[PDB]
Amino acid sequence: LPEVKVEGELGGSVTIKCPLPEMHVRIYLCREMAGSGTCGTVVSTTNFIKAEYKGRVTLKQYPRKNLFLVEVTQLTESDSGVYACGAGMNTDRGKTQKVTL
Amino acid sequence: ERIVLVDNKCKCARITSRIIRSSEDPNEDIVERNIRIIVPLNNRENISDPTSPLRTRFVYHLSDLCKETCYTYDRNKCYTAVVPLVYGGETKMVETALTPDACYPD
Amino acid sequence: REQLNLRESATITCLVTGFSPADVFVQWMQRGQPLSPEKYVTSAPMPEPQAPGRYFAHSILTVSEEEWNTGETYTCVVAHEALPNRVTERTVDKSTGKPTLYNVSLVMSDTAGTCY
Amino acid sequence: IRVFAIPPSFASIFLTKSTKLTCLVTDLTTYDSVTISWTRQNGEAVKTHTNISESHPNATFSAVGEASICEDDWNSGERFTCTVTHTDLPSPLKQTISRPKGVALHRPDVYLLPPAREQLNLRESATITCLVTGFSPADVFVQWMQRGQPLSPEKYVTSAPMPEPQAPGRYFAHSILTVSEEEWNTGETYTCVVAHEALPNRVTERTVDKSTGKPTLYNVSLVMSDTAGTC
Amino acid sequence: REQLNLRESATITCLVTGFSPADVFVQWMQRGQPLSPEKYVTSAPMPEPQAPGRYFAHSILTVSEEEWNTGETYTCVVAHEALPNRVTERTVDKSTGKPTLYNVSLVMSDTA
Amino acid sequence: REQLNLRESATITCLVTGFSPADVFVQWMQRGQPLSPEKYVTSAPMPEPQAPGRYFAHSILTVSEEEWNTGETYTCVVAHEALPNRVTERTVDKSTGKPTLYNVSLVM
Amino acid sequence: KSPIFGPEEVNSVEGNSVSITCYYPPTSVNRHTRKYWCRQGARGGCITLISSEGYVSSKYAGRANLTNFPENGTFVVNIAQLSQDDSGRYKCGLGINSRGLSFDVSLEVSQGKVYTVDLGRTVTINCPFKTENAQKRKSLYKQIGLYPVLVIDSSGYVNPNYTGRIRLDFSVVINQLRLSDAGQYLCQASNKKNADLQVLKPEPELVYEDLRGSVTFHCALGPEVANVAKFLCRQSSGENCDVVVNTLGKRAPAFEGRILLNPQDKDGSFSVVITGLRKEDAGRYLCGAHSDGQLQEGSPIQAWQLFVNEESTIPRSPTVVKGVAGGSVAVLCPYNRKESKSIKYWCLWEGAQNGRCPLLVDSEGWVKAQYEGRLSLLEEPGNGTFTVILNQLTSRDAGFYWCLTNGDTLWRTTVEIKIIEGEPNLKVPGNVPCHFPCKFSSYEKYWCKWNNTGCQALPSQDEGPSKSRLVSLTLGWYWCGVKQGHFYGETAAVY
Ligand SMILES: *[C@@H]1O[C@H](CO)[C@@H](O[C@@H]2O[C@H](CO)[C@@H](O)[C@H](O)[C@H]2NC(C)=O)[C@H](O)[C@H]1NC(C)=O
Ligand SMILES: *[C@@H]1O[C@H](CO)[C@@H](O)[C@H](O)[C@H]1NC(C)=O
Ligand SMILES: *[C@@H]1O[C@H](CO)[C@@H](O)[C@H](O)[C@H]1NC(C)=O
Ligand SMILES: *[C@@H]1O[C@H](CO)[C@@H](O)[C@H](O)[C@H]1NC(C)=O
Known part of the structure; x- marks a missing residue:
């Protein structure tokens, strides 16, 4: 559980690296939900992308050394939560690649 | 009639479910959940390390159990540690048995 | 709960989302015995509005309320090309739904520590 | 002139893997004519001793014994003897040593009792006791280890097995360790390790320290969550 | 507390430590009347590896455990010269070591 | 506590301390009606060690242990000149002297 | 619940020793933990009366013993000098008293011419006769209500209660006694003498x-x-x-x-x-x-x-291994690893009551009439199990098969063979066709020359999927089957 500390301007873009166990059942990025304290998915292994983050993020899979990359095209200065990657059906406790912005 | 959902001996966490039939009809049967948890209260934080500090905070997330640091010794599992036993000049590392009932060689 | 209160019949629903490329045989088996095709009715797969490629489907199985009350498992099976073993048996029975009572017991003992 | 014959305890058989028989002669005149071979039940002997000292702190003679006996010989219990060659004795003296015969084999129970509250109030030193009750045969070997590695034997002082009051064939020892009260008050884990020929892996250990040993308060924090959780 | 669990017996230890002329005579008594001598056993005095002049002794009493959870008091009487009044007493009971605070804190949530 | 554990009887003490002159009257009454003189015994006044002018006194009431366990609320009354109304009553029972054993803190 | 098992209810007369044996699952922990015999006190948990670790109470001092038989998996507690006080509820178990793992034994001690027989068994009663008179008028008498209400007619007719099972001579013999038949009958011959009859389940x-x-x-x-x-x-x-x-x-x-x-x-x-x-x-x-x-x-x-x-060392065995008609199956039968096989008998069932199993095959290799050829047993997976195969999917073969062994622990594991007609996974009969689906072909389709003694592999088409398999013996009963290696997949029957 490591938490990458990234900074970028209003237009500055951030890339996120997470491990890929090659399971491919579900690998996902999760913004921290501060309004309730749990974790809410933003991108996963099936197209679901958040309405507030509509078409501003994408995922990339690499088998060379098992990369799952989140690329954010835009950035509306909205404080990015703890983008904790995880695997499996259970989002809340599948957390691993901790990232904060 | 209990359906034992889980029995985790790493944490003394047993979950069983039962449809108790209070009234003599349908749609009044209470479906239950009998979580039973035994707190060690004197076990160390590191169960296999005797000298570790005492464990005071016990966290139980019922999803990680329905499907790692343990809280209680499993009685069927042989827990051992290594201790130096210096006798003469010859210090020797020996395999002490933390749980002696379960650690007899077969 | 309302249709159970009505006292006539109950309908368990098997819903499959995703469904990349149509393709799915859904079978309803109870106690390992496949049930009659008359009882369970499936649906023609329609798309998803969350993703046009995605395809969802439903299949309802109706029984008497007493059969569900008894506790029979009636678990539905899904067969898709995507399927890892090429089948699923997702799960449900009366006593595995939302609970109404919780007596959590938290016994604390200074000489516990070796979980029987 | 003093001569003592000491049998090999189970601790020596376990840790050193060698059964050494010691017939020591001390506090006498020096002649350097010592050559002793430990004689078996018959006339033959195994080996000679080594490392005899021709000087003593009180300006006398000090001798030691040394042997290497195969362990099944000790298990069977054939009688052993030591006979002296030193010319100070007009007639050689024979010391008889052997293992007691077929006893039972119970296993110890180890209990650590922390220092009393009255002793802790004085802020001088606290005594922690290790009680070994229940064993059988009469040999047991207890070591103390302050938080980590071994305490040196000046500190504690275990007694000798002495038949338990009301349990016909079991025994009990007692080893007491004296420590500074701060040392006990900081919170150190003190461990008692017993080696016995009846335990699982011959050894076991029980540790106790400041807050485990008879604490005034229990401080817990159950934090159960996800009480629902699709199970 | 790990011996009472077995619910077999209870071994109470009287630790006299410190005396000079090693001659210490210890008895056990419960409710006045002295306990008969085949219950406890007393070790012979041994020098304290610490205090070079002093000596110590430990006397154990094995009582049936049910009795001991009846909160019965057992007292250790020890006699030695350096003792002001020539004797001294110590009393032990079921509640001699009871913890003062069971300070628990339960955090029950339905949200992970 | 030990006398209660023995279960045969129990003695309640009334320690009337720091009064002058020496004379004083001590009596007991459980519920309202004065307890019969054989039950309790009052000591004679004696000079208090610390305060030099004040003399203390004791009154012991012997009652059955089971009666004490029922919390019968006895009261020891003292009559003395220096008192404002010449009478002061103090009551005791099993309930009195029990601290807050259970301290539950429910928080939302 | 607790896997400990013992007598749910002992009973005895005062002054008579009793033996109570409690069974526990034989494991190292169970064999080396503390064995305790406690008495459930009315309010308070067990007071441990005796333990395997040399403890005996205030009482049971010289009266009791507790022996541990780890090999049998039991422990026996013997209580001598029984008394009316030693009656109540006890528990026998392992580990700690306040812990569960135990069994409840309800012990009851009863205060201390008699004939005691089991229910439905022969018994006879004697009634002394005065010889001064040759034969006084006598019949049988019963103890019901202070006066032998007619129990046998003096003419010899049997009472409806004691019908068709009594003969009289002074000896009276009755067989097939029910539980209510016994009683302390007072018989006279009028010379009244006492008697006792007892029935014990x-x-x-x-x-x-x-x-x-x-x-x-x-x-x-x-x-x-x-x-x-x-x-x-x-x-x-x-x-x-x-x-x-x-x-x-x-x-x-x-x-x-x-x-x-x-x-x-x-x-x-x-x-x-x-x-x-x-x-x-x-x-x-x-x-x-x-x-x-x-x-x-x-x-x-x-x-x-x-x-x-409910805590058994016996591993899971697939209860049913249904297969395609004309195809083959594979039955992995577990056995005790400790003791290796002697004779791997393999059986059928005649019925649910008779069910005399018919050893289809044995370690020697003898095979039955209809399975002559089309059946085999092939030891490996050696590590404490094996694999009996049966190719050429006949219907009649549907039923239950037992994996017998003449070792010690005789589990007779049973397996159900549900045969269903369908596509056969490998090809037909030789002369040499053979075929197994590409999905099934991830392994190594092999051929064996069938011998009731031992299956031995022989050359055939040894290539990739070819139409898929085939058999060639260019220059009997033969097998053309898939092999996992350790384990084995289905068969193929060629001539
Ligand atoms: C304490 O915890 C750690 C895990 O948090 C574990 O330590 C390793 O486990 C092996 C098991 O035998 C130990 O023998 C090794 O010594 C440990 N690795 C190391 C650091 O040596 C185990 O739970 C405990 N190990 C300790 C602290 O001795
Ligand atoms: C007791 O537990 C609470 C809650 O975890 C903690 O805040 C406190 O520091 C603990 N105190 C001690 C003495 O362990
Ligand atoms: C008692 O527990 C509470 C909460 O668990 C904690 O905040 C407090 O510090 C504890 N007190 C002591 C003396 O440990
Ligand atoms: C009892 O609980 C309340 C809750 O806040 C706390 O303030 C109080 O200090 C507690 N009492 C004691 C004696 O700790």
């Missing part, structure tokens, strides 16, 4: 068996009753013998295939074998010949109290 012979295992009951009833049809109850709460197996032919529906019944021996002692025991098999099984079959009174019976451990 036979104590159950406790049998502690494992889940997914097998049990054997030995109904050694007396030869006399021997020829009367015999049966095997399963005693419920209220007196109703859910008859499981019957010599006459009755069969219990939820016990098909599995149960086998040995034929009666010279005497009258047959054994009943049950396999694949489950948690619902725990209960009192009552024997008893009395032609009808239903356990009815006035019949010699023998009792067993089976307890099925």
